[PDB]
């Protein structure tokens, strides 16, 4: 029976391949070629933010596009004011091995995680006057990679034991567990309407999941090695990914296929981050050759380089109004470009 | 103004706190601990605690002599290894009276030639000498590998072959390989592991003075 099931699986794979092939009539290289090229883009450091004692692993813009959280390897979580280069908060942690951070939409809580397989949730507004830990969520087996709030009482975690989970803060339990991968999990992004989310998982395969139901809906392939970053276009029906083979691609769900392949012949270092712009016209990226590249998302051509770092770039992000951009790298400095 | 002016104080105080933590961050000695021999690891840690007094990650903290020491002792380990680029030395423990020696050698080769470990030194422990001495008293011969001289010899011709077998496989060397045969005298282990790091830091300081 097992061999019969394998034959059925092969037939189903052939079905999927044929259905995908039946989709493409117009390639994007024959439509986006006639648009006006953006030309030259270049911007300069306005504010430089110093103070971290070691490498920088994550950052996240606020909901008002003015405050900033940052997580470093020394065990510190700093809250900055990006206008006057002021330090608003400095939070110390219990584990020194940290790999992610998040900023709650309402502005009351932050989150962190790392190699201790625990996700910690902090309260920023208290009557006594100091930042104190509110919840300590546990139950995974490997380390965490990314965490992303939805409301003030629901959080999502992904861990490199092939696992994802949805936690209800106040109760403290797992409302749903998502399984189906084979290797670790590296990155996930949430939708603007906040009903679905996507994750890439270190085996050249990416998945779209729904939270209200609980099943795994869609799968995509195409890469030759593991996946390092994933992000949503600003309408909830696209996403962009970059791998450790020094290649980036764009996926849409209804087309169920890839469209662009942003590549070059002189680049041999993999990706570490991605993020979009407001109108979906600039795709930023961080590499290991010490640069931050600026692609035009519709042509796979080149638009700019934000050079200026003395080591590898780890994280980058965009405000909620489009004015500013922020980057952070292994040299312990974090820069604001406009 | 007149209320965007206490914020400046607050920022300066936070800056002062971080600026006083920098120095203590820079004085610390971080050692990573690897091997397939759990009994040796347990014994060595117990002895280290005795000297100092005079799951996840399990960090142990010590003070050898006015210096702070941290030992970490944690299939896709290459992703895990990103966080260990600020360490000073890797301590590899191997059983000698064993076979699984080829397995240990393969693991050694996989660990050493890594891009992240271009500026870390390696300390090698070859343990369980008493069993090897007893089992060479009634000597059991080697395998088909070219043990050129004195196949059923005393330990003086087997130790050299083993240390030479491990010494190679360092394709990008740039540094020496310290080695040691573990003894039941605790102070010997403490002294050797304190000497290795001292030599490493002298080796780094003579590059700014152009040897």
């Amino acid at each position, epitope marked *: 029976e097992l061999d019969q099931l394998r034959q059925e699986a092969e037939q189903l794979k052939n079905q999927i391949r044929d259905a995908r092939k039946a989709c493409a009539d117009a390639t994007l290289s024959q439509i986006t070629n006639n648009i006006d090229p953006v030309g030259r883009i270049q911007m300069r450091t306005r504010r430089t933010l110093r103070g971290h004692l070691a490498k920088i692993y994550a950052m996240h813009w606020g909901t008002d596009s003015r405050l900033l959280v940052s997580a470093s390897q020394d065990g510190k979580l700093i809250i900055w004011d990006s206008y006057t280069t002021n330090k608003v908060h400095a939070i110390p942690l219990r584990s020194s091995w940290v790999m992610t951070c998040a900023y709650a939409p309402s502005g009351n809580y932050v989150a962190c995680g790392g190699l201790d397989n625990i996700c910690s949730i902090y309260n920023l507004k208290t009557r*006594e006057g100091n930042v104190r830990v509110s919840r300590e969520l546990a139950g995974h087996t490997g380390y965490l990679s990314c965490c992303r709030f939805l409301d003030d009482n629901q959080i999502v975690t992904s861990s490199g034991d092939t696992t994802c989970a949805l936690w209800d803060i106040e109760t403290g339990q797992q409302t749903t567990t998502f399984t189906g991968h084979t290797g670790d999990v590296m990155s996930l992004s949430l939708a603007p309407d906040t009903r679905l989310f996507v994750s890439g998982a270190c085996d050249a395969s990416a998945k779209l999941w729904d939270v209200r139901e609980g099943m795994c809906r869609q799968t995509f392939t195409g890469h030759e090695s593991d996946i390092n970053a994933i992000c949503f276009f600003p309408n909830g029906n696209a996403f962009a990914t970059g791998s450790d083979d020094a290649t980036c691609r764009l996926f849409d769900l209804r087309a169920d296929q890839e469209l662009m392949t942003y590549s070059h012949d002189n680049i041999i270092c993999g990706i570490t981050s991605v993020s979009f712009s407001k109108s979906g016209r600039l795709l930023l990226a961080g590499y290991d050759d010490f640069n931050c590249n600026v692609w035009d998302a519709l042509k796979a051509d080149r638009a700019g380089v934000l050079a200026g770092h003395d080591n590898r770039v780890s994280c980058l992000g965009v405000t909620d109004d489009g004015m500013a951009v922020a980057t952070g790298s292994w040299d312990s400095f974090l820069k604001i470009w406009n | *103004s007149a209320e965007d002016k*206490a914020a400046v104080e607050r920022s300066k105080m936070i800056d002062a706190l971080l600026a006083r933590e920098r120095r203590a961050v820079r004085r610390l000695v971080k050692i990573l601990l690897l091997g397939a021999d759990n009994s040796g690891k347990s014994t060595f840690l117990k002895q280290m605690r005795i000297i100092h007094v005079n799951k996840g990650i399990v960090e142990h903290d010590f003070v050898i002599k006015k210096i702070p020491f941290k030992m970490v002792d944690v299939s896709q380990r290459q992703k895990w290894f990103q966080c260990f680029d600020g360490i000073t030395s890797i301590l590899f423990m191997v059983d000698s009276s064993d076979n699984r020696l080829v397995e240990s050698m393969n693991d050694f080769e996989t660990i050493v030639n890594n891009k992240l470990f271009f500026n870390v030194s390696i300390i090698l422990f070859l343990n369980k000498m008493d069993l090897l001495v007893e089992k060479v008293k009634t000597v059991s011969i080697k395998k088909h590998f070219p043990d050129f001289r004195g196949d059923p010899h005393r330990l003086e011709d087997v130790q050299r072959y083993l240390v030479q077998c491990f010494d190679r496989k360092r394709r990008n060397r740039s540094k020496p390989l310290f080695h040691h045969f573990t003894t039941s005298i605790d102070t010997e282990n403490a002294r050797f592991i304190f000497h290795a790091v001292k030599d490493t830091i002298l080796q780094e300081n003579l590059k700014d003075i152009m040897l």
Partner: single-chain antibody
Amino acid sequence: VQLVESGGGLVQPGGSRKLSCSASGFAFSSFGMHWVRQAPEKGLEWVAYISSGSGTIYYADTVKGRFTISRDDPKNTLFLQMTSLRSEDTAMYYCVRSIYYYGSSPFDFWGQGTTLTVSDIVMTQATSSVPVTPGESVSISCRSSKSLLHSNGNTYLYWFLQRPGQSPQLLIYRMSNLASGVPDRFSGSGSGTAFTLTISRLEAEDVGVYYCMQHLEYPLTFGAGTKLEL
């Protein structure tokens, strides 16, 4: 949260006093502190300020050089030392908490103060007595003598409340925002140098006197206050 003060009493001409304040229930080392005064039947008036880290110290013009402020962190205690007091120093004194980072809400907590007895921008209060009955929507006005807006978009001004027999309580900070522990029926707005607080669906326990402060730059100045009746 608790601020408890001690030191009041009766004194002769000359003399001296040392008033103390003990804080319990919160983090003292991250806050700035103010001493504020009140005449027996008149409005409030600001006295002195000592900040976090024991750096900036500000005094008032009418007692400067006679009073002294100090703080002790490990024991969580404030002191004010007063010397050579005349007959116009009879009043009641209160201790106030504040913190200044982005988004902060100063003047949130107040103490209970002590009695002491002995043998610049200008704001104006329109009236002193306005009679109303429950269910009536009311509005109360204050005036000033300069723009309180700033090039960073702020607008510094405060409405506080004081019921019949208690200590004050923050109603509206920075002329537009609302504090914690207060109902949602309060609001307030105005143009440069002329403004009004709106109270809707008026019920009981709103009787008392209302106060309007400014905080554009030291010194800090008060008004007279409007007293309501029911």
